[PDB]
Amino acid sequence: GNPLVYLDVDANGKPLGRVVLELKADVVPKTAENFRALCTGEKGFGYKGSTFHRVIPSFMCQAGDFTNHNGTGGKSIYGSRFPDENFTLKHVGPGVLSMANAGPNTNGSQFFICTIKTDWLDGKHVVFGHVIEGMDVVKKIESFGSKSGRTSKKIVITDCGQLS
Known part of the structure; x- marks a missing residue:
């Protein structure tokens, strides 16, 4: 069936717990596969050690820029960017997992987990999974954001991988 993957997240160097995500490979196989492989690190790069760099309360938590750690970088397993x-x-x-982008067909490695319904992103961002377990951890992460997106704690994916 659809893959289950995990992110273990610290804030200021202490563990918050684990977020478990189900990836909808039946609907978006290419997008799901990219995420899966970036969690395992099996291509020699991926999310381990990277950050949630932009977090906005009552909106979403954004991560996946494992190259520049600021929202400008990331790469996919296929190349730097890939289509919608x-x-x-x-x-x-809440709990929707979706690809961040810089316009049409600019998916890389950056992603966000929504903490509310964000209907205006429909048709603009590729949704590819959902939180199975760990919304408590997502809410903690959310609580360390701000209106500007700047985080007030350093939020780090210490470990990640595939469960099934």
Whole structure:
């Protein structure tokens, strides 16, 4: 079935716990596969050690820039950027996992987890999974954001990988 992956997240060097994500490979196989492989690190690069660099309370938590750590970088397992696969899944509520981008067809490695329904992103960002476990950890991460996106604690994915 669809992959289950995990992110173990610290804030200021102490563990918050684990976020478990189910990836909708039946709907968006290419987007799911990229994320899966960046979690395992099996291509020699990926999310381990990177940060949640932009977090906005009552909106979303953004991460995945493992090259520049600031929202300008990241790369996919296919190349630097890859197309929007489809917009079939919608930003329905808290726990949605979706690709950050810089316009059409600019998916790389950056992603966000929504903490509310964000319907205006439908048709613009590729939704590819959802939080299975660990919304408590997501809410902690959210609580360390600000209106500007700047985080007030250093939020680090210490470990990540695939469960099934």
